[PDB]
Every structure is written in C-alpha cells, then in structure tokens.
C-alpha cells in the first residue's frame, strides 16, 4: 500500500542485497550453480546470471529496478551484467549504517556517491594498458578470449576474421579538431546483420558487402551470376494506365472487357520497352507488375522483381548505382550496375538468394552463416555475437583493463586515500564505495575456496605497496600478477560498471517513499 | 514437523526391505489364505456373495469367489492371476495353487525372521521344486488309457465333482460322464485330431423338484416355445430342418424401400403384393420338405400363417451360440437371406418335442438312437436357489476336468485325499537334508506347506488335526518288505465325520488327482510365492 | 501405499456362523405367532402406502424380505415350501 | 533478503538436501543392482502391475518428489540413449560420491575442491579403462563369448531358469542379422511379438516371421515342405459394378443367377491365379502356394483355393506385406490382368499355429529373410513386460559387444581394480593439490560402491568379498602378473571373471563413470536452492 521514511530506505537496501545475493556466487571463472526450481515442476542448475535474474520473481520494486539495470548494461556493453548487479547491491549496503545508523540524509550520501564515481573513472584509466586496435592479429588474441570453451573455438580465426571485418567497417576511425573525435562509434546491432543459411559447414561463414535480399523474382531460374549488370529502380506500375480524372471503370456487357485488356496491353508494353530500353539485367518495381509486363521484361533475358518496398530500394541503389525514379519515362541511361564483380543468384538450402554486392563498404555489411543443422548455424551465431561484442568494447577505446579483481581492488585503494582529504560529512559514505569494491575479489576468493580475509589482506598488500595489477588467480586461488596470467578485460566494462552501479544506488537511495495507485 | 527418511516419490509411505514390505505383503495375503483355506475338501464351507447389482449367491468354489472379490493388493493379485493360470487349460487346481502359495509364504517368514535372505530362500523353493516335480513322476499307479467308457470316466468324474457338491455325487457323476459319453467318439490311440470341446456339454435347470427326476439330453434344450401352430414334429425321422438369421417376414430394402398409399387400390395392390411375396418366400421353404423352421428372429403373422398351413414348426432361437450349436445337432447352416434355404443347408432331426421339466416347458431338439447329435444338454432340477446354482457350477467343473485328459500323459494318476502331498513331505525333506549348506533351510520348509492339504481335509471333516497328521505321518513313515513302499502309498485322510480315529485307504473309494493337475499346480504355487518373495518394495505413479 | 479392500467387506470365522444365526432367529421372531389356528395377524406397511394384515406365514415372510443375505436363505426355502407343499412355511 | 511467494536455502543446507535426497533415490535402486538384486512393483494407478529391475523403466515410469532425486533420474535416464544399460550404475556411483564428498564438506573442504578432484580422478580413471580392457577376437563365429555376453545381460533381468531359453535366442537372433564381412548391424532386424496362452518356458526363436491373420477354411494346408508366394493387393472379395445397376428378376432362379454372373469376375481373376499355381510347380511333389492377399478374400474364393491346396490369407496389415516382400523376395502385384511367374516369391516349411484364441502363420526358411522373431510368451501382463525387457536388453548387449570389440572382465573387477589404481595413482604423481587429495580419494572409495552393492544383494558379507579380492591382487601385483579378480556371488569367495563368463561393456563402463561424475560434481557445486513461485 504505502511505504514511507526509514522503512522505504531499509526496504529499497534490503531488496538489493537480496537480487545481488542471488548471484553472488556465480561470478568468475569457476562460478557455482543454482537451482532454481520451477512453478511447472522441472528445476534447472543454470548459473548463467542473466537467466538466473530473469527466471527468479520478485516483489520489491527495488529489485525489479536491479532487474532493469541488468537490461540496461547488456544493451550498453556486451558484459559486466553481473558485476554491475553484485556492486549495486554492495554500495547499497555500505550505505546502510550511514544512511539509518548515522543519520545521514541521502541528499549527502548521494552527493558523496557521485563524487566517489568520478574517482572511480579516473583510476580505471590510470591501471589500465594500451592495445593496438588497428593491428589484426593483436585484435584476434584478444577475441578469443570470448570464444574459449565454445564449440566454434577450432574455428575461431574465422569468428574472429568476420567479427574484425564486421566491426571495422561499421566503425568511425577518426580524429580531428572540426567535427570532433567519434570516440570509435561501432553498432553491431543492426549494421552487422547476422543471417544463417542452411548448408555447409562453420568455415564457410563469409562477409558481404552490400545488399542481400531474400525476395524471389518471377522467374527462379536465372544466370549464376551477372558479369554485366544493370538495375532498374522504378515505382511506377507497370498496368493499365489511368489520368489525373476521377473516372473509374464500370463494364457491364460482357463482350467489353476486351477494350480494357487491349488499351492495358499496349500500354504495359509500351512502359516495358522504356525500361528494355537501358537493356537491364534486374528491374526491381515497387507497386505492381501485371502479368503481361512481367512477360515482356522476362522475355528479354531480365530477372524481374515486384513489389519492393522504398525501403529497399534506397539500400539497393547505393550498392548497385541505380537511381529511383517514380516515371518509367524517368528512367536513364546511366543506371547500370558498375563497379561490381558480380551479382549472384545462387539458390542455397532450396532457398532463393539474390547477392548485390559490390565494391564499396556503405558503412555496413551482412554476415552469411553456414552449418549441416539448425543446431550449428545458432550455435555459430551465438559464438560470433560474442566475438563482436569484444570487437566492438576492445574496438570501442584501445584500452584495457587488469581483471581478477585487479581493476576493482585499485579503485578502492585509491578511493580509501583519496578519502584521507575529502574533510567533510561526505568522508563517511564517500568510503561506503570504497568498500563496495572488494565484493569482486571477495567472491573470486570465495569460490576458489580460500579464507576471504587472509588473501584479501595480502592482496591489499600487494596493491598498497605494489603495482595495481595484481589479482586473483581463478584456478588456484592465489594472488597472482595479471602480467602472467593476463586476464585482460576490454576497459568500457570496468567503466560503465562502476558507472551503473553507483548510478543505481544512487536512485534507490533517494526513494524515501513508495506509494501504491493507479 | 516429524522429519521422515526414505520418502521422496510423490510423498508415497513405501516401505523398503528393511521395513518389512515382503512380511507386510505376505500379511495381506493371509486374508485370502484363510478365506481359500476352508474351502478345499469334500466337507469344505460355503461362502456368501452379494454382488454389487443385488444379487445373492452360496459357493463352496473359492476361484468364484476370488473373480467377486475387488482385489487391490497387489500382493494379492499375484495369487489371484495364479488361480487364472489353473483356469487357463486346465480344469482344476484352484484351491491348491492358492493353498499351497499362502503356505509357501507362511513358512518363508518363518525363515525371514532367522535372517535368511530372500533371494536365498527363493533359490531354494526353486530346487525344490524341480525335485518335487520329478518325484511326481514316480507317484503315478494307474493311468486313463482314453478308452472313452463310462466306466473310466466316473473314475475321474466323481472325484471332481466332490468337493463341490457332497453327497450328490454320484447322482451328478451319472449325469456328468452319460454326457460326456454321448459326446465322445468311439476311438483309441487317437492323438492326432482334437475333439471334446468343453462346449460341447451344456447344463439346464429348472427351479423345483431335485435330482432324482434328473436326466441327459441327446441335443439341444431352448427356453423358447414353438411359436407357431404346430408344436411337435411326427415319428417319423429325418426332418428337414431350416434355419435363418432373417426374420420371416418380408423382405426390405437396402435404401429406401418406403411404401407410400394415397389411393384405395394402392392399398389393396401393394397388400396383395406383399402377401404374395411372403408366401413365394414360404412356398420356396415348404417346396424343399422342410418340416421345421427356426429363426434367429421373429415371425409376421402372415408368415406364421403360411407356415402353419405347410405345416412347418415354428421355434425361435435368438441366441447366436445357440444357432452355432444347432449346426452340431442337425447340421443347418443359418440362411443370411430369407426364401432359399438351399437343401445342401438343410439339417435333419429325429425328434422336436415340448418337454415339462420342474414345471417349466421347453422346447427339444435330439435324436434317439441315430444321426446321433455332437452336443449334450443335462437337465439339472431342484427347489432351493442357492443349492441348484452351485450344483450347475459342479456339472461344469466334471466336464472341464475330463478335458484335462489330453495326449501329454494327463490320464497318470495319483493317489488323493493328500497321500500325495504326505508323501511329498518325507521325499522333499530327505532332498533337503542331502543338501548343503544354507539351501536345505528352504528345501525343508518347502516340505512343510504341504501338510496343509492333510491338515485342511481333517479341519474341514470336524476331525482333531492334532491325532489326524501324526497317525497319517506315521501311516507312512512305516516298515515294509522292501526299499520300495506298495500298501503305505495309499494312506488318505477319512473325510467320513466319525470319533474315534483312523485313515483310509485310496483303494476303497478310487480317490485319484490327476498329474497334469498337480504338476502343474506346483510350477504355479512356486512362482506365486517367489514373486511375492521377490517384491522388496511397491511404488505407485502416473504410466 | 496399497490396501485390499477400497470399500470391499468380508467377515469370517465362527463369529459369521452366529451371527447368521442371530439374524435368522429374527425372521423366526417374525413369524413365531403366525403358527396355529389362533395365531396372531401382523400389520405390514409396504412401500405402497398400503397395509397388510395377516396371520398368514408365507404372506408375511414374501412381504418382510430380510435384507440380511444369510436370514435370506429362510425366505427362498419358505417359498419352495409354498410351490413344492402349498402349506406348512411358518413350520 | 527475500521476497514474499519464495524460498530459498542459502547456508550448507542447500548441500544437506541435495545430498539427501541423493541418498534416498540410491538407497532404492541399489537393491536392483546385480543378477541377486530384488525385483520392484510398479502400480500405475488403475490397479495393473509391472515387474523391473531395469534402471531407465524404474526411472522413466516413477514419479519422483524431491526436484535434486528428478535431476539425477533425467540424467541417469538418458544413458539408455547412449549406452542402452548402466543406468543403475550411475545412480548407485552418484550417491557414493556425494557420500564420500559430504563428509570431506563437513571438514571444511570447498565443494570446488572435491569437484576438481572428481575430475582429475575421471581423467585417470578413462585412462584405467583402456588398459583395463581386453581386446575381443575380430571374428564374429565366436557363439562361445556371445552366449556369455547374453547370459551376463539376461542374469540380470530374469529369474536364472528364463535365462536357459533367453539365452541362445538373444545371441542368434542377434549373430543372424550380423551383417557378413565383419560389418555393423541393425538390432531393429528382430521383431519382439508378444503372445499369451503358454508359459513364459516356451519363449522360442523363429527363423522369419509370424502373421496374425491365418487362413478360414478348414481345408487349408496345415504345412507345406516349400512353396511360391504371391504378393497380391487386388481384392477377391464379391464385386459388385462399379455403375449404377442392378439385378432384375421374375424368378428366384434368375436373381441368383444375375447375381452369379457379377461374381463371374471373381471368378476369372481366381482363375489366373490358379493357372499360375498350375504353371509354377502345379502338381510337383513336396510344392506348395502362398497367397498373403493385401485384401479381403471372399469365403467362396477361400473354398476354391483350399481345393486346389493353396493356403491364401487375407487382410495383411501393411507391415506385414512390405517385409514380407522383402523375406520371401516376390513382388507386389497390383493388378491380376499381368500376373506372372515373375511377381512369385519363395519360402521353405510354411505351416499355421493353432491357439486356443488365435492362430499364427509360420514364413520361416527362406534364401535371405534379412529378419528375425522372437515369440515372447506368457499368461500374465507383468509376465510377458519382464520377458520382452529381458529379451530387448538382452538384444542390444550382444549388438553393443558386436559393434563394439572392446570387452571389460566383470563382477567388480574393474571398480576394485579402479579404485586400488586411482589411490596409488594419486600419490605417485602428486599432480593435483595438498587439497583437491581428498575428492581423488572420495571418488577411488566410491568406486567400490558397485562390489558392495552387487554383494550386499548376494547376502554375503561385503567386508569379506573386497578383503578376498585384495588378497588374490596382491599376489598378483607381487608375481608381476596380470590378473583379472572379481567376486562370486554364488559361492562368496573371489573368482576369475574370465573364466566364469562375466563381461561389461566398453560403452557402458565409459559412460557410466563419466556420467555418474559429471551428475555428481553438478550437485555438489549447487550453492543455493531456489524456490519461487511453487
């Protein structure tokens, strides 16, 4: 019904410590497993994160906030789902005695979070190391790292090969004092479009550049390919030919209606002769194509394809060359199709297929998948995804950051000194982050099941005196140097967790009141 | 709040091998043990069955009883399915697979109780067993050379019946083995053709009167009346016997066929019509020499009207079976049409009369002394319910019992009133005492159960079990002139209700069971009381 | 987890004997003063809302039809005295 | 920190349950392991009883409540897909496992610990196997051995009397359809037909196949030495016109005669199917003719077959009809109009069965029937349920050996073997950790939950059984010899299992260790139970 003061506050902190609670335990290499037992009756032991939120209920709008934050980091960065989840619980909860013990008003408690966020960044930065984005082969040692332990792993240059050509040709690669660095703007969501085509096998997976369509034409069988093309791009109908009038037809004698299929027949081959014209190789028509004009073009030796939205179009004639025109009488000489090896008609899987690429990048491409089974053919398109997700986040700045807990452990060193001058109400929840970011190297300890206290101590020990990338090692559960065991994670996850997670706490922290109404 | 152990399947309380579960289930057949048990034996008990549609019933026939009974423990169904075994090409045994298993059971908990495994006492039932079936062998003193003589018959006939229906039994041997001869062909040495099937035989009754006006029937009895003028065929032999499946009537029409009238010719033409076809129908019958007419179906008037002018009798039979049993009476085959019973399907019977048995008039179809029918009725009598009901089931146990003399050596024969199973005793024992090691535990308890023959025929007689068994032991446990016994294989338990004390001889009264029937009867008691051994556990789900 | 009966009843041994017995004594009680010829008449409501008066054994003993499966067997053999005799079937 | 509507275990007890129920599901089926195991009742509600021992049928047909006991019963279920047997197996070694991993927990040992161990001792523990086995003889006219791979399977299943009849049936059967040229074979090559009214003793081997439909007519041959088949799918029931018509008549005469002269057509198609009879061996001594009619067969055309010695049948199923073309090696022929000697098939003795119930009709001796029956009989459901699983079991263990030429000395002499192996193993190279030791040790212990098991079924003393297998392998080990030692369930003392007859399946061991390990380790690493809406 109603929720108000201390009790909103504790209950908004109670919630998130529980979701992050959930999966405490299943972050790093040797994550632990869940059952989660179903209404249905079945059970799972999944210890995938995001399925084990997503699959678990929850009461609390709090939680259901920590539900959407999860949501919210996948679309931004391809990881860090459950970092951001375990470290917005943790803040959260260091908060707590501050917050209700203290008597500190969330309005400081906010503030101090926010300025612990901007320390936070800027040590991110000071541990993490370069990487050259533009060498090809730095880049595939890097993208392994998220095809490991996956079926495609054997094929892995070839995952990585299209993951480096997808990523770099939707990337803007620029820098200068006018328009302004991009900062490596790349979308792997919709200029990359991943397509999976039954046949072959995972080595047969190929990049095109330029436009697929998956519409069938009026005649399937047609030259394997176009040595010669030329498109045409018309909107006008190929029918009956009406004016500007209002006048409608109305035949009631039956022996009439040979007086409209007689004008239409010469008016339809009068418009199919304007598009011959040009001695096409594809005419593509948005609205309607009778019958007759689909013989006349065919007839000629001319693929023919009706019925394509302007949608398509645009997409086609910056690929082919072709220019839209809405007359069949403003069609011209020069749309041909230039500039092009070859436009491929080959049918796959029983399957018709029509390839316009070229030899110009529009900022986009198409990857074709291919596989003996359904089976394989997502299990390839799930394996890539990865690839380009750590493509796109190494891509996306030439920086990483040391993983193992390293990264986590530098911030809150050196947000603990920095506390040391931050004189003020706010040095008391200004360490709560501080603290928060131990969650990570804790819950490695955990699971390689050593005293959470002693390797702690003596990784703080190490990081105190010694260099910031020092971490935990996965297998053993020793503190280690990520020099050796490399563990390097693309920097724009260490970042944007840190970011989403104070950012969370933040909001939860300021809801002193939950109210109930429609 | 009380924690439970062991119970994870649907929330089922299943008891596990150290719980008891095979002592539990063998309890649970001990309901049904005692129920069987006080049936066998001439003198055995009556039992009352109210079946769920109200209706009443007395038997002395435990395997009734069990087929009326709602059996749900599973451990019970073992024996129950058992008893089906005895019914299934056998014609007796019932009470001894039942007895016999319980007893298996009673003894096998007494050696549970010591810590003899299970599986340790199974193997040994199971090589008893094999003994006991191979000492039978050697039991055999006379045997049915399947001569088909009433004579041979009532040697077998009269013990069946007993223990069934008791101080009858020579009365309905009489009926039992005249029928059974009148079916049975005149042969010997012949193996190779069956015959005799237990349908052959069938039983009528009449409520009123009893067994002494009793009689056998050569051919059919029907419960329906000669529903046209003439009731009775002449002296004469050989009449020609018609029979359909089509009512007498006249004929339909596949589609269609109504007959619609608008005009008074109309009626007068389509009524002559249809009186003509009827007749065409019964002239083309008559016009064979057909003198007897039985339908599957009803008559018109008109056809009964032209029948009676033929002077055809009439006699409906709407019993499929009964149709079927009348092509081995007079050898018609139903007509599927109406009009044309061709000659080649015409049957012939010496006499078809009326008959008043207990009150009630039937209708007979026989022959006497020729064209001698496969088929034979006999007529059962008597005023009390209860009484003449069980003495119909007694008739029908005689005959299924003679079909057990089949080729396999059935007619070898044994002595009864438990001679055998006393003998059974001191020849499995010394199995087990020649055994070693942990076997001859179940091989000698294997010896026990089968006291509880000799031990239920004195119960029921109203003797004192406890001078009746050590007088049978020590009637053969005795001394004679030769490793081979001969007088002391014949010592039986006296079903005769007297005082003071004694056994009686085999030879007195010619009790013999067959081998077929006991060898049988302990392959199926042994592998009912294994089953039951070998289920540690019941669970129940969702198939 | 199994039982035998579901709602199934059976009752044996020599207690079943008396008590079959008990109840056949009633039918007796019943009738004991139809015998004679100054028997007494019993009144009998039927499901028919109408009444019989008699002193007359096998009217009575037809009409009373004891329920009791064991009492029955007094009512079936009364009646085989009333077809085989035509009399006697309080006796 | 929890919402309402839910429940969750977050402390050890989430472990404690988990191992709980394990032991539970164990402490059922261990009872079905071994040829001395106990037999389970199976009730499926509306009052009908099953008898098994079989792991999958006691997995897939109960209903289980613990939601961990489910997992491992799904899990274990899905051996019969890989392995076809073992499934007991890897309950029994599930439960050990979690077991022994329980109490090394209890010291403190994280469950990652015990899990890495598993791991490290299953690696080893393949590596075992494949110097453990013993490479069979290539030759598949070795009846010997395939007699014992179908007694160890049967022995298992059935009461040890079936097994004599089981057991020569399993292996032809199976040595039948073996493929000529040492090639693979397909088990499916043996119809499994059950039938009731004789003993379950009576179970037999038929060298080809059994039909359902026989012929009606009393004078059809009862058996014929050798005869041609003809593969019909035309009907030679009573034909009427295929247009409108009729029959009309002024007398009785002419209506049976019109009638008579429809039936002509019938006639003179039984006709052409008579002059192939005479054509094709039509008065040669010890020859007869099949007809196995797709259709219905008219009783007057079953009269004019019966006459001429043809034993005809009708109304084949279809099943029937495309394998009978394959055993008898005819053709189908659709039309009566181009009957020929060449559309004929081949059989050897031809003969009908007569049951009580129901007849059967014998196509057995043919040239190269590529198929095999087995008549599963008995009087009772659960009769004939146990004797098909016997025989189906029984089938694919022989298969397995016959694919498969990889053969494992049985009777726990691999799991004694394996476990003496792994503790040694273990020290001598040091090559997991101070601390993962202790899983290493917990799986070689839980290997030898089999020999107990197997033994404590038997009723002999399970503590005597492995001291006597330890004492015969150290004589071994000292003599430099190798030795193959199991335990005798008979006598209680140990034995040679290559000399008593007793061999596991390469797949079955693989697969069950692999299996039981991998089950094992996903329960141990569970660390919260979680309920939600339930």
């Not at chain 1, 969650?439 to 699971?447: M, V, Y």
């Not at chain 2, 019509?273 to 016009?287: C, L, P, Y």
Request: net charge negative.
């Amino acid at each position: 019904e109603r929720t108000t003061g201390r009790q909103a506050q504790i209950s908004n902190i109670t919630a998130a410590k529980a979701v992050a609670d959930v999966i405490r335990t299943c972050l790093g290499p040797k994550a632990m497993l869940k059952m989660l037992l179903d209404p249905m009756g079945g059970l799972v032991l999944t210890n995938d994160g995001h399925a084990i939120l997503r699959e678990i209920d929850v009461a609390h709008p709090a939680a259901k906030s920590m539900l959407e934050l999860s949501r919210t980091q996948d679309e931004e960065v391809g990881d860090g789902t459950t970092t951001v989840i375990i470290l917005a619980g943790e803040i959260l909860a260091q908060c707590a005695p501050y917050l209700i013990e203290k008597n500190i008003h969330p309005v400081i408690i906010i503030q101090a979070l926010k300025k612990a966020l901007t320390d936070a960044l800027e040590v991110i930065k000071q541990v993490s190391k370069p990487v050259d984005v533009e060498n090809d082969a730095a880049m595939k040692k890097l993208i392994q790292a998220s095809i490991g332990t996956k079926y495609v792993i054997h094929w892995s240059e070839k995952m990585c090969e299209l993951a480096l050509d997808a990523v770099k040709t939707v990337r803007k690669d620029l820098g200068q004092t006018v328009e302004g660095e991009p900062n490596f703007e790349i979308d792997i969501k919709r200029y990359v479009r991943v397509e999976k085509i039954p046949g072959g096998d995972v080595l047969d997976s190929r990049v095109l550049k330029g436009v697929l369509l998956n519409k069938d034409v009026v005649h399937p069988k047609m030259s394997r390919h176009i040595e010669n093309p030329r498109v045409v791009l018309l909107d006008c109908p190929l029918e009956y030919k009406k004016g500007e009038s209002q006048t409608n037809i109305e035949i009631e004698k039956e022996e009439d209606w040979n007086r409209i299929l007689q004008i239409e027949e010469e008016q339809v081959q009068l418009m199919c002769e304007q598009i011959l014209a040009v001695r096409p190789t594809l005419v593509i028509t948005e609205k309607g194509v009778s019958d007759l004009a689909q013989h006349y073009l065919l007839k000629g030796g001319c693929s023919v394809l009706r019925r394509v939205k302007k949608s398509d179009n645009n997409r086609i004639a910056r690929v082919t060359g072709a220019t839209i025109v809405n007359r069949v009488e403003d069609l011209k000489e020069s749309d041909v199709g230039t500039n092009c090896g070859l436009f491929k008609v080959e049918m796959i899987g029983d399957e018709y297929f029509s390839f316009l690429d070229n030899c110009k990048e529009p900022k986009a491409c198409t990857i074709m998948l291919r596989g003996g089974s359904k089976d394989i053919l997502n299990e390839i398109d799930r394996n890539l995804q990865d690839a380009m997700a750590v493509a796109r986040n190494v891509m996306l700045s030439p920086s990483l950051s040391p993983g193992g807990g390293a990264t986590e452990m530098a911030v809150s060193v050196k947000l603990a000194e920095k506390a040391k001058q931050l004189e003020g109400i706010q040095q008391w929840p200004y360490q709560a982050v501080a603290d928060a970011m131990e969650c990570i190297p804790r819950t490695l300890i955990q699971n390689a099941g050593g005293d959470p206290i002693r390797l702690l101590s003596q990784l703080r020990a190490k990081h105190a005196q010694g260099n910031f990338t020092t971490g935990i090692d996965g297998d053993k559960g020793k503190i280690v140097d990520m020099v050796s065991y490399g563990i390097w994670e693309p920097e724009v996850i260490k970042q944007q967790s840190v970011k989403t997670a104070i950012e969370s706490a933040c909001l939860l922290l300021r809801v002193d009141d939950i109210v109930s109404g429609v | 709040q009380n924690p439970n152990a062991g119970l994870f399947k649907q929330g089922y309380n299943s008891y596990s091998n150290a719980d008891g579960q095979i002592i539990k289930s063998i309890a649970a057949i001990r309901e049904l043990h005692q129920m069987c048990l006080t049936s066998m034996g001439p003198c055995g008990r009556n039992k009352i069955i109210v079946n769920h549609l109200g209706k009443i019933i007395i038997t002395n026939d435990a395997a009734t009883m069990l087929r009326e009974l709602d059996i749900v423990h599973p451990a019970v169904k073992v024996l129950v399915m058992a008893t089906e075994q005895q019914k299934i090409d056998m014609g007796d045994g019932t009470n001894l697979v039942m007895i016999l298993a319980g007893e298996l059971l009673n003894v096998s908990e007494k050696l549970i109780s010591m810590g003899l495994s299970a599986v340790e006492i199974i193997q040994g039932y199971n090589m008893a067993r094999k003994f006991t079936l191979k000492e039978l062998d050697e039991m055999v003193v006379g045997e049915i050379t399947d001569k088909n003589d009433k004579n041979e018959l009532l040697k077998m006939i009269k013990p069946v019946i007993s223990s069934k229906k008791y101080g009858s039994e020579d009365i309905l041997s009489e009926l039992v083995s005249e029928a059974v001869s009148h079916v049975l062909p005149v042969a010997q040495q012949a193996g190779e053709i069956p015959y005799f099937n237990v349908d052959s035989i069938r039983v009528v009754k009449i409520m009123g009167g009893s067994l002494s006006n009793s009689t056998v029937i050569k051919g059919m009895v029907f419960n329906r009346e000669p529903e046209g003028h003439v009731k009775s065929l002449s002296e004469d032999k050989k009449h020609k016997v018609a029979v359909f499946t089509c009512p007498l009537d006249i004929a339909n029409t596949e589609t269609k066929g109504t007959v619609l009238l608008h005009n008074a010719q109309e009626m007068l033409d389509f009524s002559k019509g249809e009186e003509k076809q009827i007749d065409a129908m019964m002239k083309e019958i008559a016009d064979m020499g057909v003198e007897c007419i039985v339908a599957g179906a009803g008559v018109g008037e008109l056809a009964l009207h032209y029948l009676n002018r033929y002077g055809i009798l009439v006699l409906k039979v709407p019993s499929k079976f009964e149709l079927r049993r009348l092509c081995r009476v007079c050898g018609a085959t139903p007509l599927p049409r109406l009009g044309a019973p061709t000659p080649e399907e015409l049957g012939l019977v010496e006499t078809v009369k009326t008959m008043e048995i207990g009150g009630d008039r039937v209708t007979v179809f026989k022959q006497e002394q020729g064209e001698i029918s496969r088929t034979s009725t006999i007529i059962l009598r008597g005023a009390t319910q209860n009484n003449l009901d069980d003495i119909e089931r007694a008739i029908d146990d005689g005959v299924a019992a003679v079909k057990g003399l089949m080729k396999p050596s059935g007619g070898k024969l044994l002595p009864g009133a438990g001679a055998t199973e006393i003998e059974l005793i001191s020849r499995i024992t010394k199995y087990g005492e020649r055994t070693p090691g942990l076997l001859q535990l179940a091989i000698k308890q294997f010896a026990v159960a089968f006291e509880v023959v000799p031990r239920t025929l004195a119960e029921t007689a109203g003797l004192d079990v406890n001078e009746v068994l050590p007088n049978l032991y020590a009637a053969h446990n005795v001394t004679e002139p030769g490793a081979v016994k001969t007088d002391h294989l014949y010592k039986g338990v006296d079903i005769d209700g007297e005082s003071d004390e004694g056994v009686k001889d085999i030879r007195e009264e010619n009790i013999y069971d067959m081998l077929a029937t006991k060898k049988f009867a302990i392959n199926v008691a042994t592998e009912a009381a294994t089953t039951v051994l070998s289920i540690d556990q019941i669970i129940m789900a969702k198939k | 987890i199994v039982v035998l009966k579901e709602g199934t009843d059976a009752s044996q041994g020599k207690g079943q004997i008396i008590s079959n017995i008990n109840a056949c004594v009633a039918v007796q009680e019943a009738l004991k003063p139809t015998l004679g010829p100054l028997g007494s008449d019993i009144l009998i409501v039927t499901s028919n809302q109408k009444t019989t008066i008699s002193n007359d054994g096998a009217t009575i003993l037809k009409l009373l039809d004891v329920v009791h499966p064991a009492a029955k067997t007094l009512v079936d053999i009364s009646r085989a005295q009333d077809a085989e005799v035509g009399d006697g079937t309080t006796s | 920190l929890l919402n309402p509507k839910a429940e969750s275990l977050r402390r050890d007890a989430a472990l404690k349950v988990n191992v709980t129920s394990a032991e539970g599901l164990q402490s059922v089926l261990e009872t079905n392991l071994g040829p001395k195991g106990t037999l389970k009742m199976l009730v499926d509600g509306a009052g009908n009883i099953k008898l098994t021992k079989d792991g999958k049928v006691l997995l897939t047909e109960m209903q289980i409540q613990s939601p961990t006991a489910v997992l491992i019963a799904r899990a274990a279920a899905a051996q019969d897909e890989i392995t076809g047997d073992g499934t007991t197996t890897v309950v029994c070694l599930v439960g050990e496992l979690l077991r022994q991993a329980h109490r090394f927990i209890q010291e403190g040992v994280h469950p990652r610990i015990i899990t890495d161990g598993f791991e490290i001792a299953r690696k080893e523990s393949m590596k075992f196997l494949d110097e453990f086995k013993i490479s069979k003889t290539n030759l598949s006219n070795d009846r010997e051995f395939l007699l014992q791979v179908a007694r160890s399977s049967l022995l298992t299943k059935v009461d040890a009397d079936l097994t004599e009849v089981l057991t020569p049936i399993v292996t032809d059967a199976v040595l039948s359809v073996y493929d000529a040229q040492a090639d693979n074979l397909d088990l499916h090559m043996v119809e499994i037909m059950q039938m009731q009214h004789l003993s379950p003793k009576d179970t037999t081997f038929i060298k080809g196949l059994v039909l359902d439909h026989g012929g009606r007519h009393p004078d059809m041959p009862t058996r014929v030495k050798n005869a041609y088949v003809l593969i019909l799918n035309v009907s030679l029931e009573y034909e009427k016109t295929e247009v409108n018509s009729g029959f009309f008549y002024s007398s009785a005469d002419q209506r049976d005669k019109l009638a008579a002269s429809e039936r002509k057509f019938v006639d003179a198609k039984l006709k052409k199917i008579i002059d192939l009879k005479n054509e094709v061996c039509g008065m040669d001594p010890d020859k007869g003719f099949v007809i196995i009619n797709q259709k219905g067969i008219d009783p007057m055309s079953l009269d004019v077959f019966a006459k001429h010695n043809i034993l005809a049948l009708r109304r084949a199923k279809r099943r029937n009809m495309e394998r009978l073309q394959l055993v008898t090696g005819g053709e189908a022929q659709n039309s009566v109009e181009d009957l020929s000697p060449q559309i004929l098939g081949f059989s050897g003795l031809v003969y009908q069965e007569t049951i009580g119930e129901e007849k059967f009709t014998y196509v057995t001796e043919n040239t190269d029937p590529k198929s095999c029956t087995i008549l599963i009989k008995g009087s009772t459901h659960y009769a004939l349920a146990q004797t098909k699983d016997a025989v189906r079991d029984g089938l694919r263990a022989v298969a397995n050996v016959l694919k498969d030429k990889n053969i494992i000395p049985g009777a726990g002499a691999f799991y004694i073997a394996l476990s003496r192996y792994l503790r040694s193993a273990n020290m001598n190279k040091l090559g997991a950790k101070g601390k993962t030791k202790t899983g290493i040790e917990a799986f070689a212990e839980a290997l030898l939950v089999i020999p107990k098991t197997l033994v404590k079924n038997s009723g002999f003393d399970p503590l005597d059984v492995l001291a006597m297998v330890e004492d015969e392998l150290d004589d071994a080990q000292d003599s430099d010899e190798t030795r193959y030692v199991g335990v005798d369930l008979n006598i209680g003392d140990s034995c040679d299992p290559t000399i008593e007859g007793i061999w596991d399946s390469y797949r079955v061991l693989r697969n069950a260790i692999t299996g039981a390990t991998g089950i094992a380790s996903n329960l141990l690493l569970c660390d919260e139970l979680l309920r939600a809406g339930r």
